[PDB]
Swiss-Prot record, chain B:
Core component of nucleosome. Nucleosomes wrap and compact DNA into chromatin, limiting DNA accessibility to the cellular machineries which require DNA as a template. Histones thereby play a central role in transcription regulation, DNA repair, DNA replication and chromosomal stability. DNA accessibility is regulated via a complex set of post-translational modifications of histones, also called histone code, and nucleosome remodeling. This is Histone H2B 1.1. One of its GO terms (cellular component) is nucleus. The nucleosome is a histone octamer containing two molecules each of H2A, H2B, H3 and H4 assembled in one H3-H4 heterotetramer and two H2A-H2B heterodimers. The octamer wraps approximately 147 bp of DNA. It comes from Xenopus laevis. GO terms for molecular function: DNA binding; protein heterodimerization activity; structural constituent of chromatin. Its main location: nucleus. The chain holds residues 33 to 125 of 126 of the full protein. Monoubiquitination of Lys-89 by BRE1 gives a specific tag for epigenetic transcriptional activation and is also prerequisite for histone H3 'Lys-4' and 'Lys-79' methylation.
Curated annotation (Swiss-Prot), chain C:
This is Histone H3.2. The modification N6-glutaryllysine is found at K19, K42, K78, K85. The modification Phosphotyrosine is found at Y4. Acetylation is generally linked to gene activation. Acetylation at Lys-85 (H3K122ac) by EP300/p300 plays a central role in chromatin structure: localizes at the surface of the histone octamer and stimulates transcription, possibly by promoting nucleosome instability. The nucleosome is a histone octamer containing two molecules each of H2A, H2B, H3 and H4 assembled in one H3-H4 heterotetramer and two H2A-H2B heterodimers. The octamer wraps approximately 147 bp of DNA. It comes from Xenopus laevis. The modification N6-crotonyllysine is found at K19. One of its GO terms (cellular component) is nucleoplasm. The modification N6,N6-dimethyllysine is found at K42. The keyword Cell division does not apply. The modification N6-(2-hydroxyisobutyryl)lysine is found at K19, K27, K42, K85.
Swiss-Prot record, chain F:
Signal peptide: none annotated. This is Histone H4. GO terms for cellular component: nucleosome; nucleus. The chain holds residues 26 to 103 of 103 of the full protein. The modification N6-succinyllysine is found at K7, K53, K67.
Length: 105, 93, 97, 83, 97, 78, 103, 95
DNA sequence: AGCACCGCTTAAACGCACGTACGCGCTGTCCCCCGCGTTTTAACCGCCAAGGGGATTACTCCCTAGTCTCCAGGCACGTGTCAGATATATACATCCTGTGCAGT
DNA sequence: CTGCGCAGGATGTATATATCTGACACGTGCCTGGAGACTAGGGAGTAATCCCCTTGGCGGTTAAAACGCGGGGGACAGCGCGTACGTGCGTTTAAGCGGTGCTA
C-alpha cells in the first residue's frame, strides 16, 4: 500500500495529520510516529463516540445521527462527558433530569 | 474553493461501526469540530512537553504522554494502546 | 370548567423542554439585541446569519446551565422557588463577575 | 435606524422556557430582570471579543468563526459552526 | 472568666487573615504527599521546593474553598459550615459531578 | 497518614477561610477533598517526571501540573 | 541595545529571542519584541507601584509576597487578570461576613 | 554552575522608576518573575492563534496589540496599548 | 449573502383575575460545637553522613527538513429518492372533577 | 347531617396514519496535497565524569495535638400567616414566512 494510513491500518489521513502538525508551530521538527499515533487516537475517539451516538439514534428509532444523539451520547458517558465538560453542542439540548423536591407526593 | 474536512474519515468509521446509519449535516459538522478540538488539545500539550524538556521535536512519545494528561482513564488507556499499536504496525510495514 | 393545580404545568413544561433542542428565545428579538450591543462597541458592523445563531446557541446553553445551578441554590435553602439571590450565589461560586 | 431597549425582546415566557429546560419549577418575579442583566454581561463579553477578532481580520462583517473563537477564549467552546 | 462561644472564633479569623504562614505542619503533609505519589510511581524523590509548591497550592485552594463553602452555609440562613455546603460549592465550581 | 491532616490544622484553614462555626463531619469531608486535589495534581506532576525520565519530581513538574489544572502558582520558577 | 532605542527598561533582545524560539510563528516582526517588552514593562510597573504603596501602608521598606497579594486582590482590574493565580505566601484579604459579627 | 536567566534586574530598575526608596525580597522576586513569564505566554499564545486564524505567518506588533486587547481588562489594556504604541514609535525613531 | 422592505398569517406575548400553596417569621427543644484547663505526642531544629541521581560534555549516526516530479485521494459539483417533518385523526393516561356512601 | 373516598370528564400526550418535501448520499470528473526518492545537516541518544541535592538517622526542648467537661446557642422541626406566582382567558402585538430587490 501507498497511503501511510494503510501502512498503519487506519481510517484517518496520516498525511493530513502530518501537514497540520507542521503548519501549526508546535515544534521545529515533527517525528514520524507522532502523526500516526495521533491520527489513530483521533480515530479511537470518533469511533468511541459514533458508537454511543448510533445507539442513541437507535433508541430514538432513527437512521440518522443528529446532534441530540451526540449530546445524549456524551453526557451519558461519565468519561466522554468530562473530556467535553466545557463544550457546547449546537442543538444538543439537555439530559432529562428533574430534581426530587419538585416532584408531587 | 476547497474546504477540507474529516467528513469522509468520519463516514468510514461510522460505517465500520453502525453500517445502517447516516449522519446529518449538523451532526457531521459537530463531529468535525470535535476532531479539531481534540487535535489542538493534544498537539498543544505535546508542544508544551517538547518545550519543557528543552526539546526541538514532537515524537509519538510526546503525543502519548500528552494523551495521558488530556484524557480520562479508560479513554486514555485504550487510546494509548490503540495508538502505540498503529505505530508498531507502521514501523514494520 | 377545569383547572390544573399550581406546579402541575411547570413539571409538564420542564419535561417538554427537556425532550427537545430547538431554541427558546425568539429569533428576531435575539438578533436586534446582539446588533445593539455590538453597535455600542463599534458602529457599522454586519453579521453572518450563522454568527448570530452561534451566539444564541452559546447564550441559551449558558443560561440553561445557569438555571440548573440557580435551581440547586434554591433547593439548598430549603426553597423550591428560584430568586435573584440564588443566581447571585451561583455566579459568585462559578467565579463570574 | 436607531436601536433602543432591545434587551426587553428577551420576553418573560422565554426566560421561562430556558428555566424549564433548566429544571426550575418555581420562578420568583425578580428573576426576569436579573436574567436580562446576566445575559447582557454575557453577550457583552462574547461580542467584545468576537469584534476584536473582526477588527483584526480588518472586516466590516462578523463571521461565525469570530464568534466561535471568542467562546473558545472565554472557556465556552462551541461545536457546530466551524473550527 | 469565660469568653462567649464564637468570640475567639472571630478573633482567630482576624489573626489568620492577617498572616500568610502555612497552616498544616509540613511533615504530616509531606508524608501524605509521598504516600499519594507512591501509588503512581515507586522509588521517587521530591524536591523540597516541589513539596512547598504543592503545599501552597493546596492550602490556598482549601481556603478559597471554605470561603465559598461558608457562603453556602450563609445562603441557608446557617452559620455553621456542613459537608452539604462543600458538595454544593464544588458541584457548582464543576469540580465534583 | 491522611488523618495526619489534623482537626486543628483544618480549623485554621477554615478560619483564614472566613468560617466561624464548624460541623464535626466537615473534617473528614475536607480530607477526601484534599486527597482528590493532590491526587490529580500529583498524577499530572508525576506524568511530567515519568516523561522527563527522572526519579526526582521537581517543582517545575508540580508548577506545570497546576497550570494544566487551572490553579497556576507563582514563586517556584514561573 | 534597543531597550534604549525604545526608552524601555525591559530587555528588548531577550524578548525577540523568546518569541522566535517558543514556537509562536514561522516569522517574527521587529516591532513586536518592542511592543510586548513594553506591555510587560508597563504591567510590572503597576504591580510594583501598588505593592510598594502597600509596603509603605504596612510600614516596611522591602516588598514581600503579601504586599503583592494585597496590591493584586485590592485592585479590581489586576485581580481579574490574575483571577486564576495563587500567589505563594499571599494570605487572604481580611473579610468577615456581616451575620458572623457580634450583635 | 549553570547560568539560569530571569527578569530580576529589570524588575528592580522598574521598581526604582516607581518607588526609588523601596526594596524587594527574593520570595517576592520569584513572584514578579513568575508573573512576567505567565503574562508573556498568555500574550504570545493569543498572538500565535491570531496569526493562524488569519492564515498569516508573522507575529507583528499589531498581532501583539490585539492579543493585549483580548487578554487585558478595559483600563489596563488601555494604558498597555499606549506604552506599546509609544515605545514602538520611539523605537522606529532611532536606528 | 447580508440588509432592507412588505404583507399575509397566527403563534406567541401581554395583561388581568383569582386563590393556592409556598416564602418566611415565630417558636421551641435538644445537642452539637466552642471554650478552656490539663495530659499526651510528635513537629521541629540543629548536626552530620553517604550515595543516588541529575547535571554537564564530547561523539556519531539516525532521522527529519528541504527539495522535485509525479498522480490519485479528496473535493465540488450535479442529481435522484427516501428519511423525516408536517397535518390530521384517534386511542390511553391522569389530574381533578363532582358525585355517593360511609360513619358519627 | 357531614367528611372522605370513590367514581367520572376533559385535558394533554401519546401515537397511527398518510403525505409532501429537500437533504444526504452517490456517481463523475477534475486538481491539489501527498507520495516517492534523495541529500545534507544537526538533534538527540548514548556513554563517560561529576558533585549537588536528597535522604536519613539521631535526640532536646517546646509548641502543638489531644482529650475531656460543661453549658450555651444554633440547628432543625413544627406551625401558622400572608401573599406572590401559576394558571387560565381574552386581548394584543410582532415573529416567522418566503418573495423581491440592491450593493457592500
Amino acid at each position: 500500500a501507498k497511503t501511510r494510513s494503510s501502512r498503519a491500518g487506519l481510517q484517518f489521513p496520516v498525511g493530513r495529520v502530518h501537514r497540520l502538525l507542521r503548519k501549526g508551530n508546535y515544534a521545529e521538527r515533527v517525528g514520524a510516529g507522532a502523526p500516526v499515533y495521533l491520527a489513530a487516537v483521533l480515530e479511537y475517539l470518533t469511533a468511541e463516540i459514533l458508537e454511543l451516538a448510533g445507539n442513541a439514534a437507535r433508541d430514538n428509532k432513527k437512521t440518522r445521527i443528529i446532534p441530540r444523539h451526540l449530546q445524549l451520547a456524551v453526557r451519558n458517558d461519565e468519561e466522554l462527558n468530562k473530556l467535553l465538560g466545557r463544550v457546547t453542542i449546537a442543538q444538543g439540548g439537555v439530559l432529562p433530569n428533574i430534581q426530587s423536591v419538585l416532584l408531587p407526593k | 474553493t476547497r474546504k477540507e474536512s474529516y467528513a469522509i474519515y468520519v463516514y468510514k468509521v461510522l460505517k465500520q461501526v453502525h453500517p445502517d446509519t447516516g449522519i446529518s449535516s449538523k451532526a457531521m459538522s459537530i463531529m468535525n469540530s470535535f476532531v479539531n478540538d481534540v487535535f489542538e488539545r493534544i498537539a498543544g500539550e505535546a508542544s508544551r512537553l517538547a518545550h519543557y524538556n528543552k526539546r526541538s521535536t514532537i515524537t509519538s512519545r510526546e503525543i502519548q504522554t500528552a494523551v495521558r494528561l488530556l484524557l480520562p482513564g479508560e479513554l486514555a488507556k485504550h487510546a494509548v494502546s490503540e495508538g502505540t499499536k498503529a505505530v508498531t504496525k507502521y514501523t514494520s510495514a | 370548567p377545569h383547572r390544573y393545580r399550581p406546579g402541575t404545568v411547570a413539571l409538564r413544561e420542564i419535561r417538554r423542554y427537556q425532550k427537545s433542542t430547538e431554541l427558546l428565545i425568539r429569533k428576531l428579538p435575539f438578533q436586534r439585541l446582539v446588533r445593539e450591543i455590538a453597535q455600542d462597541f463599534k458602529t457599522d458592523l454586519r453579521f453572518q446569519s450563522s454568527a448570530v445563531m452561534a451566539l444564541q446557541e452559546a447564550s441559551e446553553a449558558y443560561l440553561v446551565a445557569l438555571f440548573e445551578d440557580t435551581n440547586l441554590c434554591a433547593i439548598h435553602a430549603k426553597r423550591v422557588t428560584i430568586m435573584p439571590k440564588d443566581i447571585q450565589l451561583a455566579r459568585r461560586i462559578r467565579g463570574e463577575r | 435606524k436607531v436601536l433602543r431597549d432591545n434587551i426587553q425582546g428577551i420576553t418573560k415566557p422565554a426566560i421561562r422556557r430556558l428555566a424549564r429546560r433548566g429544571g426550575v419549577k418555581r420562578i420568583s418575579g425578580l428573576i426576569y430582570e436579573e436574567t436580562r442583566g446576566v445575559l447582557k454581561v454575557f453577550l457583552e463579553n462574547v461580542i467584545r471579543d468576537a469584534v476584536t477578532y473582526t477588527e483584526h481580520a480588518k472586516r466590516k462583517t462578523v463571521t461565525a468563526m469570530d464568534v466561535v473563537y471568542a467562546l473558545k477564549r472565554q472557556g465556552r467552546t462551541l461545536y457546530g459552526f466551524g473550527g
